[PDB]
Design a protein around this ligand. Structure first.
Ligand SMILES: CC(C)CCC[C@@H](C)[C@H]1CC[C@H]2[C@@H]3CC=C4C[C@@H](O)CC[C@]4(C)[C@H]3CC[C@]12C
Ligand SMILES: CCCCCCCC/C=C\CCCCCCCC(=O)OC[C@H](O)CO
Ligand SMILES: CCN(CC)C(=O)[C@@H]1C=C2c3cccc4[nH]cc(c34)C[C@H]2N(C)C1
Length: 393
């Protein structure tokens, strides 16, 4: 048809590209460099947890370095693909790869924190350097597999002109099941681990309270004991609970000030000595020793119990909120991407416009994610402050 009023010539969108550089691309590249430099040279930050965390910082750095800048060309020159043709499947592949790896890294981290709560007795038996490298490798294999349909299939190609996009027609299956594997599955897992963590912390605080009153009750049992035999087992009941309460937390392998967990080492040592008296038969002498156990209880143990529960609870809450924001900002993209495949009434043209926008809410979500996470750690936070002032020694 002929419509001369159809002056639908796309205006210049350079100001949006400049704003994504300033507000998204630079914070992504800068923020993940800091996290990488920190784990790299700051010798006090080099352990298993961070090597996995560094891997995440790498994935997010690669997003802002190879995915995000070429995504600007989607914006500057709206119609066509400026780069060579083989760069199109390469770019799309790197996009799905690095974006998926970031989401799955957080899923794994969540599981580790829950495991660290449930079973703190995992000192280099696992959660070591070998364990670190295995889960790093797996996450990448998962994200490689999810991303690999894109280059294997490719974008259809006559003129050597291509439009770099995943259409509903050609990648409908991938747009649907590729989102489930990359987002909604690690989302479901993180929802499950969330409630499991609440149960773990409540069950842990409960057990500690039981250990506490076990110590105190048996103290009165000892103090009010006329017989010898009931002193001996009242002491061994204390010894079991003390070890029980101590084992609800890793050793101080970890740390510059007081270590309340050491109180259990002292307490048990006193119990054993008092238990030697009970065996010899010196009951009156043993009861006096048991009264001295209270000094250890008042000094170390009482503060330890509130220390453990409060600290584990706190670290749990903040980790949940930051991981919640990550997922929440990735929500508008993947929900839209799904409805693009499952809704046939919606205008695909404008439903694609929302995709091209929501992807930047996700990009900045992945990009600044390790920074926001590491900033609640003092060693990282102090390291950053020295880096931004260009100080290395
Ligand atoms: C065209 C666009 C993408 C420019 C990219 C921005 C890059 C080149 C610039 C902008 C801000 C810069 C960062 C600013 C802060 C620091 C602290 C310094 O101790 C280490 C390098 C680091 C992390 C810089 C690395 C390079 C950096 C990320
Ligand atoms: C109704 C259920 C819907 C939302 C509630 C669940 C909120 C899920 C928030 C997930 C945040 C998260 O990743 O938690 C991991 C956990 O903290 C690791 O220790
Ligand atoms: C606006 C257009 N772009 C960029 C070219 C996308 O829609 C990208 C397509 C993706 C995508 C499609 C289909 C399945 C998937 N799993 C994981 C991703 C994914 C990542 C996801 N990236 C982040 C955006």
């Amino acid at each position: 048809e002929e419509m001369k009023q159809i002056v639908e010539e796309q205006g210049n969108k350079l100001h949006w590209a400049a704003l994504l550089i300033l507000m998204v691309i630079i914070p992504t590249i800068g923020g993940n460099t800091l996290v990488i430099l920190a784990v790299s040279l700051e010798k006090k930050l080099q352990y298993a947890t961070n090597y996995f965390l560094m891997s995440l910082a790498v994935a997010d750095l690669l997003v802002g370095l190879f995915v995000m800048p070429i995504a600007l060309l989607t914006i500057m020159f709206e119609a066509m693909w400026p780069l060579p043709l083989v760069l199109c499947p390469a770019w799309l592949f790197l996009d799905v790869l690095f974006s998926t790896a970031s989401i799955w890294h957080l899923c794994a981290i969540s599981v580790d924190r829950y495991i660290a709560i449930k079973k703190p007795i995992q000192a280099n038996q696992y959660n070591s350097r070998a364990t670190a490298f295995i889960k790093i490798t797996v996450v990448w294999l998962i994200s490689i597999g999810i991303a690999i349909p894109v280059p294997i299939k490719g974008i259809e190609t006559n003129p050597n002109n291509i439009t770099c996009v995943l259409t509903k027609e050609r990648f409908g299956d991938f747009m649907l099941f590729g989102s489930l594997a990359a987002f909604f599955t690690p989302l479901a897992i993180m929802i499950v681990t969330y409630f499991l963590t609440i149960h773990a912390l409540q069950k842990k605080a409960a057990d500690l309270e039981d250990n506490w009153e076990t110590l105190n009750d048996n103290l009165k049992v000892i103090e009010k004991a006329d017989n010898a035999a009931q002193v001996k087992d009242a002491l061994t009941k204390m010894r079991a609970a003390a070890l029980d309460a101590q084992k609800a937390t890793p050793p101080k392998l970890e740390p510059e000030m007081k270590d309340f967990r050491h109180g259990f080492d002292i307490l048990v040592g006193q119990i054993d000595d008092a238990l030697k008296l009970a065996n010899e038969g010196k009951v009156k002498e043993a009861q006096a020793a048991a009264e001295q156990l209270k000094t250890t209880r008042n000094a170390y143990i009482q503060k330890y119990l509130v220390q453990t529960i409060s600290n584990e609870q706190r670290a749990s809450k903040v980790l949940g909120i930051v991981f919640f924001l990550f997922l929440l900002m990735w929500c508008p993209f993947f929900i839209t991407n799904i409805t693009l495949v499952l809704c046939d009434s919606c205008n695909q043209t404008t439903l694609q416009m929302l995709l091209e926008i929501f992807v930047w809410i996700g990009y900045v979500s992945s990009g600044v994610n390790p920074l926001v996470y590491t900033l609640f750690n003092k060693t990282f936070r102090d390291a950053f402050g020295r880096y931004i002032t260009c100080n290395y020694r």
